[PDB]
Design a protein around this ligand. Structure first.
Ligand code: IUM
Ligand SMILES: [Cl-]
Lengths: 103, 103, 103
């Protein structure tokens, strides 16, 4: 069946996207952990170096800065990256549609 | 219609990819802003620490280094990350094909 | 043919995903190179600043930390990011199925 072959093509596209989303999530977890470690060490350095004491903080808060973005310090204990977890709401709706179709 | 159901499956795959591209773009903007802040603070530190004055710069330019990649300094004011914006050229061509099909 | 039009829609979804995977791989290579340069410079700084000599290393190894994640140093010469290359196993299986279908 040509019908069967087209369903298989759709299934491959769906599976390749799901695997790529998982792979990107895994990669970003490694990047996030690494960048957070650099933030922690940079803060630890700053706290142990008296020659840096006169340097002011920019006091630019996270969200305003993300929308608007030396000098002054930009990195603070508010700079840590949170985990990235991609929504599967669309894929879940597709899965619900398939279960229904399957008669 | 089986026809209608298959169009719906294609539509879900298309929408899930578009949402994931937007989500990745949002995530990379946060990562980029954070890494740029670490570059700025690292440069600010270097400029205020006399014990680092004898350390040379590698003088490896961005593009050659990206293709070829302590020691000497690697990070400079040329290291800042630019914004990432993913092409939708293929999706735009698909949208043009759909508008036409729709008779 | 409606058949021909649906194959074209599947082809656009497949191509848009392949292009996006390539684009993400290109972007992550730039981010990875940049973060590795920040690690190298942070290590170089630490090695030239006597005021940091009493600061201990956390001695948290990469894999346990990635699963479990100042203080002590988190960044070491074991923190460098490796290259990210996304599997195309599913897409390769789809390509093999298409070659076969094509009679
Ligand atoms: O510590 U004396 O410069
Ligand atoms: Cl599809």
């Amino acid at each position: 069946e040509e019908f069967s072959d087209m369903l298989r093509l759709i299934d491959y596209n769906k599976a390749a996207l799901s695997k790529f989303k998982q792979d990107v999530e895994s990669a970003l977890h490694v990047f996030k952990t690494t960048v957070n470690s650099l933030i922690s060490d940079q803060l630890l350095m700053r706290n142990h170096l008296r020659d840096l004491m006169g340097v002011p903080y920019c006091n630019y808060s996270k969200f305003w800065y993300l929308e608007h973005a030396p000098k002054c310090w930009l990195v603070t204990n508010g700079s840590y990256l949170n985990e990235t977890h991609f929504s599967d709401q669309i894929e879940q709706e597709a899965d619900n549609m398939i279960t229904e179709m399957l008669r």
